[PDB]
């Protein structure tokens, strides 16, 4: 009803830079607006209210701004530990509204380049009795993003593939990423070759096991 | 002052469910409204409902929630969330708050205005599937043993197919942290989560266990790694 909308979706700052994020609302709320910080596994925490408010107790590196129907919040001298979702959340009204929250924006800090070391898994002797079979493949400590392609004798693997990587280490901002291959047992004994590609930018590792010598 | 909410659980499609959060350090007064708000995995933060502190009962709702959701206080440190008709859109995980606001006007005529929340419990995990639960599998993750071996060596396990979530994996009971890379679980295609954890380890320094629990079957596994 009063609908807030966060531009963009995410945004980048190097370590030391400074990011801002925006906040609409569909009418006058007449600034009351809250910021909170999410990391993983954790609830919000509150950053600022009346848009331009320091909650007791937080680093006055954050500073929220604007009046009417656009708001700001800025990070100055961003740290990796600063990489988090940040939301806004109108307070005008709780009286027929489908969400206070804004959709959310994630901050991503630009650390030093690290490429990241590959190894491939192959499954343990017991999985493939289960008749699913997995293969695992990680990407650790590594900035700035990857893309992992399978290929399985040869032909680029496009079904059964699942990727998880960790928040930005905290320190020097870098990533772990793990990328699994998930086949019937059938599917695993029709072939030989099973392959991992993890390419940053113009460099690549590739991880490969022939099923026979495993 | 704290909050915790409990009750979350695995449940069918369709299923009713009741979560309750409890307040410690102090109790509902008309200085507050104690709400409700969900997240589901990789999802925002949604606002359900809120109820006030003071004696008179006032409940707001998300339009999506009036009809389908209850909010009360069953106590001076405990309020309550009934869901009906519970769909897989459903799961996440639920946090209470506290809810802070101006009294603004003359009256009765006074109206409350500039909420926000100052305080949130850890939040409690409710999963809508048709699946029933499922303790994981666990297998060791090693270099291919066609490999020519290698003094320095990272090795893991692989934590297959349970529901609901979450499990918790330590290495060596928690000794060994240095080196531990634990990924966010994944929902595969089959409605089971999967995840993986790996720790790289300097030589033959240890032997390295997984230590993985899974609390909603009440299972413990531990899995003894080496190349």
């Known amino acids: 009803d009063i609908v807030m909308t966060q531009t963009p979706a995410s945004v980048s700052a190097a370590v030391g830079g400074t990011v801002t994020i925006n906040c609409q609302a569909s009418?006058?709320?007449?600034?009351?607006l809250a910021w909170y910080q999410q990391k993983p596994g954790q609830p919000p925490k509150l950053l600022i209210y009346?848009?331009?408010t320091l909650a007791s107790g937080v680093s006055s590196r954050f500073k929220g701004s604007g009046s009417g129907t656009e708001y700001t919040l800025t990070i100055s001298g961003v740290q990796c530990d600063d990489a988090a979702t940040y939301y806004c959340?109108?307070?005008?009204?709780?009286?027929?509204?489908?969400?206070?929250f804004g959709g959310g924006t994630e901050v991503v800090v630009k650390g030093d380049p690290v490429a990241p070391t590959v190894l491939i898994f192959p499954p343990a002797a017991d999985q493939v009795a289960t008749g699913t079979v997995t293969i695992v493949c990680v990407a650790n400590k590594y900035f700035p993003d990857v893309t992992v392609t399978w290929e399985v004798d040869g032909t680029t693997q496009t079904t059964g593939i699942e990727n998880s990587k960790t928040p930005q280490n905290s320190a020097d901002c870098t990533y772990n990423l793990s990328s699994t291959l998930t086949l019937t047992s059938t599917q695993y004994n029709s072939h030989k070759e099973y392959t991992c590609k993890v390419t940053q930018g113009t460099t690549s590792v590739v991880q490969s096991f022939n099923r026979g010598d495993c | 002052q704290s909050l915790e909410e409990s009750g979350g659980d695995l449940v069918k499609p369709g299923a009713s469910l009741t979560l309750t959060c409890t307040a410690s350090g102090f109790s509902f007064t008309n200085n507050y409204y104690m709400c409700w708000v969900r997240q589901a995995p990789g999802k925002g933060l949604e606002w359900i409902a809120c109820?006030?502190?003071?004696?008179?009962?006032?409940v707001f709702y998300a339009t999506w929630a009036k009809g389908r959701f209850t909010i009360s206080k069953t106590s001076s440190t405990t309020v309550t969330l009934q869901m009906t008709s519970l769909t897989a859109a459903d799961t996440a995980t639920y946090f209470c708050?506290?809810?802070?606001?101006?009294?603004?006007?003359?009256?009765?005529?006074?109206?409350?205005?500039?909420?926000?929340?100052?305080?949130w419990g850890p939040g409690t995990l409710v999963i809508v599937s048709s699946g029933q639960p499922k303790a994981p599998s666990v297998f060791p993750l090693a270099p291919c043993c066609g490999d020519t071996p290698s003094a320095t060596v990272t090795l893991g396990c692989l934590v297959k197919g349970y529901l609901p979530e979450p499990v918790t994996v330590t290495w060596n009971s928690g000794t060994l942290t240095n080196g531990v890379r634990t990924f966010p679980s994944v929902r595969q295609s089959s409605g089971l989560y999967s995840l993986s954890s790996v720790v790289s380890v300097t030589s033959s320094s240890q032997p390295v266990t997984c230590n993985v629990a899974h609390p909603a079957t009440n299972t413990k596994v531990d899995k003894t790694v080496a190349p």
């Open positions: 109820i006030y502190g003071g004696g008179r009962d006032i």
């Open positions: 959340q109108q307070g005008y009204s709780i009286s027929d509204i489908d969400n206070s």
């Open positions: 708050a506290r809810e802070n606001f101006d009294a603004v006007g003359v009256g009765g005529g006074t109206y409350s205005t500039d909420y926000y929340f100052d305080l």
């Open positions: 009346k848009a331009s």
């Open positions: 009418e006058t709320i007449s600034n009351y």
